[PDB]
Design a protein around this ligand. Structure first.
Ligand SMILES: [Cl-]
Ligand SMILES: [Cl-]
Length: 57
């Protein structure tokens, strides 16, 4: 369901691992979902069809 990765602050992207490959998606522009911290945990949720670059730690 959920595929983890790390985010790029400069690009506001999430690079997530899914089925043995890396996939680069834009994070949201939303204040509390954008990549705030370089290399922060992000997730692509394939159930909800969402990206979050502020994954709860
Ligand atoms: Cl997009
Ligand atoms: Cl999204």
């Amino acid at each position: 369901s959920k595929y983890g990765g790390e985010c790029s602050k400069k690009d506001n992207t999430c690079t997530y691992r899914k089925d043995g490959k890396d996939h680069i998606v834009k994070c949201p522009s939303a204040d509390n979902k954008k990549c705030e911290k370089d290399k922060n945990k992000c997730e692509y949720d394939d159930h909800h069809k969402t990206v979050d670059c502020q994954t709860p730690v």
